[PDB]
Amino acid sequence: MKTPLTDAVSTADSQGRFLSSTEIQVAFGRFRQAKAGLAAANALTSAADALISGAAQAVYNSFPYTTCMQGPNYAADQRGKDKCARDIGYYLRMVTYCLIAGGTGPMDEYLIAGIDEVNRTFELSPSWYIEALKYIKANHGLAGDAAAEANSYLDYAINALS
Amino acid sequence: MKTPLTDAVSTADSQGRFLSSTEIQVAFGRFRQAKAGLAAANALTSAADALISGAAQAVYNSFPYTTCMQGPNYAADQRGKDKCARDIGYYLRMVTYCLIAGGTGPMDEYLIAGIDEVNRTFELSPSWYIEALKYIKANHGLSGDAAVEANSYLDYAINALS
Amino acid sequence: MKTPLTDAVSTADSQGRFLSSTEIQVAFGRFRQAKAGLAAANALTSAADALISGAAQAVYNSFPYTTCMQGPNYAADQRGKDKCARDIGYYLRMVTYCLIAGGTGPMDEYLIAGIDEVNRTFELSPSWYIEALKYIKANHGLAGDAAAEANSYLDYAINALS
Amino acid sequence: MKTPLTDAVSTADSQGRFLSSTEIQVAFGRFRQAKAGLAAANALTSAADALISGAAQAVYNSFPYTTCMQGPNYAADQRGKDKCARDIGYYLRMVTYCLIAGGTGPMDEYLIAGIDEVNRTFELSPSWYIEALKYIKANHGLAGDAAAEANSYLDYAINALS
Amino acid sequence: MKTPLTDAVSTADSQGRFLSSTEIQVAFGRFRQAKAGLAAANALTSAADALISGAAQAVYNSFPYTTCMQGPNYAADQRGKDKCARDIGYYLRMVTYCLIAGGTGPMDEYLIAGIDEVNRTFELSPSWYIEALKYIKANHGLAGDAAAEANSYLDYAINALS
Amino acid sequence: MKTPLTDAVSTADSQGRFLSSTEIQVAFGRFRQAKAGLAAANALTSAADALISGAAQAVYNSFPYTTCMQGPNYAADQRGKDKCARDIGYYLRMVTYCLIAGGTGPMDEYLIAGIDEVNRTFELSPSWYIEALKYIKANHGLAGDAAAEANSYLDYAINALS
Amino acid sequence: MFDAFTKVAAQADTRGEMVSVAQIDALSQMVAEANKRLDAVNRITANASTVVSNAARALFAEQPQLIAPGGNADTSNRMAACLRDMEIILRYVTYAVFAGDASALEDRCLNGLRETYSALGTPGSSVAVGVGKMKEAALAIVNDPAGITPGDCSALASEIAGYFDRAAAAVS
Amino acid sequence: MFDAFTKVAAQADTRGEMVSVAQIDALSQMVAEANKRLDAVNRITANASTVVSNAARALFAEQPQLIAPGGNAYTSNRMAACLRDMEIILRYVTYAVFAGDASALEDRCLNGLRETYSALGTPGSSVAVGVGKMKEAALAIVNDPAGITPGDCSALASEIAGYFDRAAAAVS
Amino acid sequence: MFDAFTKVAAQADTRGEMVSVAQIDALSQMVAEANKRLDAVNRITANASTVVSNAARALFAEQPQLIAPGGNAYTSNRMAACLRDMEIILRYVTYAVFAGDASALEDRCLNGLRETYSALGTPGSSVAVGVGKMKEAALAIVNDPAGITPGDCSALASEIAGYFDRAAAAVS
Amino acid sequence: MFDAFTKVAAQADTRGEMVSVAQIDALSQMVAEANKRLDAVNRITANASTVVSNAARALFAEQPQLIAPGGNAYTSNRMAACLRDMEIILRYVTYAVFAGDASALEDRCLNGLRETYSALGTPGSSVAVGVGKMKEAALAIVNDPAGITPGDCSALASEIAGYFDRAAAAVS
Amino acid sequence: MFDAFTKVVSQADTRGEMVSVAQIDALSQMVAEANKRLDVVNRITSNASTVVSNAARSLFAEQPQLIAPGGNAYTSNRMAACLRDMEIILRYVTYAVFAGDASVLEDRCLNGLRETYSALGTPGSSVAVGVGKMKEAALAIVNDPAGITPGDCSALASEIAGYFDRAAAAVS
Amino acid sequence: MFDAFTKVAAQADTRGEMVSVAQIDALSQMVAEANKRLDAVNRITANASTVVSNAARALFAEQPQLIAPGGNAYTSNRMAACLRDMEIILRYVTYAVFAGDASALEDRCLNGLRETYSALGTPGSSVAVGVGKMKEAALAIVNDPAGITPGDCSALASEIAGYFDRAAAAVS
């Protein structure tokens, strides 16, 4: 579950050795960053509704067909509009998780792994989600470190989609 | 070669993935530490001769037999006293290397690995060297981070010998 | 390279045994089918242009955005429209190859394996190609065995895309 | 258990793939052959006693020592003559089974595998059984496909015995 | 190549250890036996022609059909009578080799390994050779250890053939 | 558990074969040796106390620091002097066992395996024990084979300690 | 595994008999309807992903607690795996039909599945529902009269229903 | 395995929620005491072999039947293995601390240990005593005021004790 | 490996073309004589061990220095291996025939064989003679008019001859 | 595994004792009859395939239901395997004799065999009878006075019987 | 592999020396510009798939013979593999940057690559062109002044260029 | 590998002959001196670690550039390895003697060693000097008249010298 702390412990255990100063340097890295990371998560959590709505709209704007084509993979009805927010919500939640964990771990385990099939099967477009994420990037309005980290996870989701 | 940087790169490569924010946290931990670490190496390097001499003596004091027993594993002659400084030198050198690298790596690869056989084969005592190290600890006269880190490698050598 | 003949030879060789009557019954099956199969391939080959054009149009009709969205994965320009034909071409050609070889082999090796990544990377919709294929099915106008078989390969590509 | 049908299912399952047209062509092959195959099994079944008697005799003629040497691997007594018919009967029965299954499977699994050690241990001659089989070949009196196929199993047993 | 000496060396090397007193006891056992073993070899070597002749005949008597049946696996001609002696020759030579090497090794390597296929393929009877060997047993006229050891190889060949 | 008998049995089993004359020669080697070996065990057993005391003393003379250095790995106190005899007693006992078993087995399994860690962990000197064994060598007063063999195990322990 | 033929040889062999004229005829007839069976296989296979996806979607609408966060199909990891099972149970059912014997299915797929689910905490009754929906859709797909020579497929359909039914039964 | 953060991130996901203002603060505090925890790790680690060896020696003095011939720690083979376990339990305990979550320890070390020992015939209660002795000595070594910035490490100590305590518990 | 079809489909694809009306015809013809090809395969196969053994016997008579002690086929180990090769070469030649393409033989059997023999000290020219003897007997066995529908098999025979010929060629 | 010596060492070490003058003597005597033991082994070994084959044949004559179609020794696959067991049990019995300790037999052969048979459906009581038949024949073969120095082998015979007896016992 | 520190350490150990005051200073400075280096890594990494895909597309446009049927990047199998390379070379280039030492790239990626391509028939010069295209786009992406503290990244840029450059050189 | 006996059996079999009276006598004599050979083996073995260590030390004193930092035997890793080789060469030399044939040594040890050293950068000539010193010390240890039945071991000595000599020769 890729985080600085578990990674560090994990190599150590895989080489059957006690934690050395190296792993302490890792912990240090993690804990120094956490400042920025936790502020960043809170910010995102309180902008949650604005951010979801906003991104949903953004995708519907880039890809208008998604609001009019018939059938269940698209968002012409309320049902589908709902699913779409739901999912974007998922992406954002994962992003907050990453920030708190200090690594991609939780997005990796809960969302990225198996996304390929889900999208292929239900005929969803990676491109849609890529836009959603692009929007969250340009609209979380975070400063300095909190920004450069959050954006890392956002871009990571994007990269996992191409 | 256990260092924060190589370790990070190494897991990443072993999971065939690009460096994430986790490994960046690792690098941060490392680079923050390096200030203390590098100063610490300078200090040790300049107190080099006092430290070795001093240590050698300490061992000869705790274990007087080593200066009078005949035969090649001991230090009754000049030849032996010279070997013994050499080795303690090696320890110290490694310790500096560790501080610079930010991990036990260089000590692991140059000295710790195979030490066991060398000592068994040539009938050298782990206890002697432990004493040498115990002295280096009490006499580098480093403080704060420098000290904690240096001591961590010195103690490490000690643990590798018990 | 999944064909009746090679599959047959290949199990045999994997069990280090001479061809038994089983494999002969396989070759029978294949040779019997090949009549329908090869006339099928001819027909598709001669209706090649009408089929491709026809299919491309069909996709543009189901997915009108694909003809006016800007940028390289879409077909608003001539360059795009040309790529799209090209690809639909590919599918058709593979289908002919399948009929000739008596299995999915050549489509598997030349087109299906690695399709996932190409589509993800270049942001191409599986759904587009599924429509292309659906059309070819309803317009090759093949009779009886030729039809049942050709359709089997078209539906196969369709399955490989969901 | 080598049959067209089980072989086909078997590869497919080993490649984690649904049955393609290829496997369908296998089944075709099998089902088309079955006609001749099942007629063949029935002829052989009704000529069962004539064929087994006949064969047993043939072997006793080629190898007359076998009806006068003392001891248990031979057929000087009734007990032995009995075993010998028993066996010949086994061979024939398997041959029918093969025709019904459309492959060597049932002979492979019930009779061929391990035959070597049975014959070695009990000091039975491969050559005796070879002759039995040669006889059944020249005496089933079968037509065309039924013959071509039966003989294939008979010659298979013969090959398994050299 | 199963001999007391090479077996002993071989386990030792497989456990990466120097030769212990165990492997010395092995050599002892070997060297002690060799006295009997070597005299035994000589004896067999000088009775070589009587023994082969005699054995070949014995076989022809036990199995009279072998001298009148037509075709190449039998000895109705001179050509065949010659092959047969040749082979018995081989068995006897291997026996002498075994006595010299103090193990079944040379018979294992030169003769026993693959004998199965050679006899199946050329339709030769194990029972023939078993007889040859039985004869050599009752006619070497060896006394004591030399006998109990030679016979041990002879019976070994016999077992290899049932 | 390396002994002539179990080694022999073991290879044979690992090659799935019955015991050949080779392994019988092994047993001969063992059983011939066992005469010298078992008298050797008895002698060692009845000189047990003189040998242990003696050896203990010898060590204390070679390495007088062992009787005065404070702390638990040394023998300044009664507790320590007791441990040491205990251990030397262990070496002696193992040596008897070896002579009885005809191999290093019992010392390997009970004492040598893991000795390395025990000595490193408790900071005991291999050299000390080497002296103890050297003495037992020069004082068991055994003659001829009993001696050659006992000394072989003693020297083996010495090698295991360098 | 057995095929329809091989199943019969296996039972004959333990009795030491050659197949009776009666049983050769039964198989002979199963042979004559070969063609239909193969259509059944090509038709289900040729629609696998519609059959699965539609069924899965129906299931989740029907039982939303499954995909609600915390339910057994939350998380891409698991959704994927759940889809993957549907498709597998389907794959094995088609194998059964092709071969005319339930063994491919019983041995390599159904057997021990109930306890895999129980131990993982997957609700079987749900898997069953999923399976039952594929059965309906599969059946409809085989019986559709479009684009095929007319005939009675009613025996085959009953057999095909059988296999689905035991897949479902094997997980409740 | 979970780390203190990830443990929380795990429970939140099964609820479909984002971490509450309350729980972020709880974690943020754990972050502010980061330095002490790392000290606790460096201190125990920088002394592992004293901690083990001394504990082992007390145990044997205390229970000589363990190293008497016939007992479970007599023979170099076994003595060595017994020391190895002590060291292992210790190593895992340090991992727990570093990560602030019992999981590394419960999963990769304590789980199934009781039954390994039962099957081998190793006396758990004894291993417990040994672990217990290392707990005391470890705790002393972390609480020592020499050479460190003064502060309250009492909460951390209580946590560290917890981990040892469950290792012992896990073999009785 | 390619089969006769697949070989053509490979060449077409590197040109980017659909097979030409010409080349479908050539294959369609190859399909019409299917039946003969299969008989060829069944007839050689159903006589494998006579083909091999007889050939090996006729080789050793011809070349006694091979089975004289010290020659490459002396010793049961080796005799068996030499038989085994003959048989393999034959097995692979039948595959080629079955598939109507020399690849299954060039790739998995002939390729690198020359250097295997050279390195072992096996005389290739001898293996060739053996292979050649099998060729002859195989051919005779396929061409025999007994028990089969009369027809011209002469093209097939020329093909089969080809495959044997390159096996031989590949070891001289 | 233990050998006769090693067994005694094993018991002495758990007691922390050197072997007593009594027990060295008991071993010393077992050493003096070494030669007979080895004849025992060479005799049984050098007759293995008669011993097994003859035994197997009587068994099947005695118990035809084993080889009737459907019985556990029917089919070459199984006949071969059944012979192979006989031979195995016998090989292991010889090892025991060679080593003068039942362990190689108990550990690597008899242990867990009862439950292999039970799971497979092999009738143990039948294997037992077979084992018993070999015992009788092996014993005969060792006790035969022809061609060997006369002496008393009665103790050895009793021991050998022992081993067979526990093999049989181990499968009822 | 070496990192920037470790590289120096090793050269020092083969001379038996401690690092000179000069060389610690040189490392001390590389430490001060830490942050920039990490930005480069995060910037290139955060853009991997644009960097690759855009590069690939404009290689193919530039060289259509590569994706014309029969060229090395025609067929999805191969296209994907070609893309996958591009990505790898890029991945390994980022590692070099992160670690401030060419070794990880030289050892685990470039080494023997030239001959892998030669043997497969992949055109090296083409790969190089592709690598060169990623080099330009990577550099642009790191040098972009938007959203970052202003400063001089010129030295780092020159370094990153060097890595790319040797990847390219290593396949020509 | 061959032993002294087996070597001869091999040569005899490629000639198709039984061993000549002369050659059995030659072996019979080697059998008579059995006891000396074994003493050879037990003596060298029973002193392995003196033989190695002393040799290694006199080598390093003689050639200090080997242990000066940067030399091939500087660093514990390598010192241990170099020791390990000495010991290996010795071990293999003892096997040769035990077996009376150079093959164990040539095959499993010397063969390809020259090229392992060259590629690693280990100085062979140095290894040879080490090996040469072990030769001298081994020889002295076997020829020492203390504690053994007096005899002429001069032939044996010459043979042992040979083995050492080819180990040395195999690395220059």
Ligand SMILES: CCC1=C(C)/C(=C/C2=NC(=C\c3[nH]c(/C=C4\NC(=O)[C@H](C)[C@H]4CC)c(C)c3CCC(=O)O)/C(CCC(=O)O)=C2C)NC1=O
């Ligand atoms: C990797 C090498 C390394 C180590 C080991 C390390 C330890 C370390 N301990 C620290 C603080 C501290 N450490 C302690 C320690 C203790 N307080 C107690 O009561 C107990 C006696 C003891 C157990 C924790 C305290 C109280 C502080 C101050 C609070 C804080 O800064 O978090 C700090 C921050 C300030 C300082 O004291 O220097 C560091 C960096 N830093 C390092 O780089």
